[PDB]
Amino acid sequence: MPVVTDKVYFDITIGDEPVGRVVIGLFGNDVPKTVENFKQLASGENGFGYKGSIFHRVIRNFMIQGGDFTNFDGTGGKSIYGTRFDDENLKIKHFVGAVSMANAGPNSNGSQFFVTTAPTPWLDGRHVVFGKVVEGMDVVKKVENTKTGLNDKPKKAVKINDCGVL
C-alpha cells in the first residue's frame, strides 16, 4: 500500500445542488511530480486549475472523469509543466477509489484524472495512479449515478464548486 502524504478536497455540485465533499489522499513519496501537478491545480496557485471545472464523462460501475479546465469536454487541460508530461511510475495498480491520470497514449498526462468505482485492472501499467479517495466515497457514488446522455455526459453539470489542499 503506497503511503498518503497530502490530501486534497473537492466540493461537488450536481445541477447546482451541493452533494458533498470528496477527499483525495495523494501518494507523494511514490509519484512526487504527478502529485505536485494535482495539488497545484487543486490550489489553483499558478492562475488556473480545477475549481469550476466539471466531470464531463461518467460511467456507472466504472469511473468518473474530470480535470479538463480548458475545453470542458475531455479534449483539453494542461499540467503545471506545460501541456503534457511524462508517466512517472506505472507500477502502482488500480483498485476501487483510485485516482489516476487520463492520457492519450504514453507520456501524455495533463490535468485530466479519473476516480474508479469498481476494479479496473485492464488499465494497469497504462495510467499513472497517484492517489485514492480517503473520504466521500458516498459522494463519488452520487456522481457515478447521475443521468447521462451522449458519450456519457451528465445531463446536469457535475461541478467542482470548490477545491483545495487540506
Partner: peptide, 11 residues
Amino acid sequence: XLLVTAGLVLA
C-alpha cells in the same frame, strides 16, 4: 472497451 483517453475515446 472501457478506456479513459483524452481526445478520441475508444471501445
